[PDB]
Paper text:
AcrIIA15 is an anti-CRISPR (Acr) protein that inhibits Staphylococcus aureus Cas9 (SaCas9). AcrIIA15, by combining the HTH domain and Cas9 inhibitory domain within a single protein, exhibits dual functionality as a bi-functional anti-CRISPR protein capable of both transcriptional repression and CRISPR-based cleavage inhibition. Our structural and biochemical studies demonstrate that AcrIIA15 functions as a dimer to simultaneously inhibit both anti-CRISPR operon transcription and SaCas9-sgRNA DNA recognition.
The HTH-containing NTD domain alone also binds to IRs with high affinity. To investigate how AcrIIA15 recognizes promoter DNA in a sequence-specific manner, we determined the crystal structures of the full-length AcrIIA15 or the NTD domain in complex with IR1 DNA at resolutions of 3.15 Å and 3.10 Å, respectively. AcrIIA15NTD consists of four α-helices, with helices α2 and α3 together forming the HTH motif. Specifically, helix α3 of the HTH domain inserts into the major groove of the DNA and forms three base contacts with two base-pairs in each IR sequence. Specifically, amino acids K31 and S25 form hydrogen bonds with the bases of the G6-C6′ pair. In addition, the sidechain of Q26 forms hydrogen bonds with the base of A4. Alanine substitutions at S25 and Q26 moderately reduced the binding affinity, and the single mutation K31A completely disrupted the interactions between the HTH and DNA. Importantly, these AcrIIA15 mutants fold properly, as confirmed by CD spectroscopy. These findings show that AcrIIA15NTD sequence-specifically recognizes the IR sequences through the establishment of base contacts between helix α3 and DNA. Additionally, residues K37, T43, and S46 interact with the phosphate groups of nucleotides in the middle spacing regions.
Residue numbers in the entry:
A (entry chain B): 0 to 60
B (entry chain D): 0 to 61
Amino acid sequence: SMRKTIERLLNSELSSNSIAVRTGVSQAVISKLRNGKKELGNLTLNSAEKLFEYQKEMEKV
Amino acid sequence: SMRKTIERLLNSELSSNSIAVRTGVSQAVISKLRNGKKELGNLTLNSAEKLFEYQKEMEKVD
DNA sequence: ATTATGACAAATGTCATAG
DNA sequence: TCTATGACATTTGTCATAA
């Protein structure tokens, strides 16, 4: 779960809900992350891996 | 913080307390992950990045 | 479709102590 | 030394809403 790649997804123009549906992570968590209420560091490795996989599968394209 | 590399440090012969001093993480969590009372998935990215950085440094020795 | 805030059960980090 | 167990304040993930 590279912090930089997850950071790219969160800073992407992709919708918070749209990222959430594909990642499987809650839109709530994505919104609170982008806005600032939650920290990426406190995220469960399981959730972090999902975000990293979604962003990497896009970078190769 | 690749799950596989952290899984490798957990499976290592290094003492739970030895890894804790070097990583800054608590012996409690490492011991509980090894015991299996704690899931690696439920760990924070902050703490896992620390255990990951340790393993990568050990990997350089090969 | 999208955006925000919660509630809640169940964890976690960071400290101990106990064996 | 080492592991094991827990306390506690805080934060999660899940599952909602309301706009």
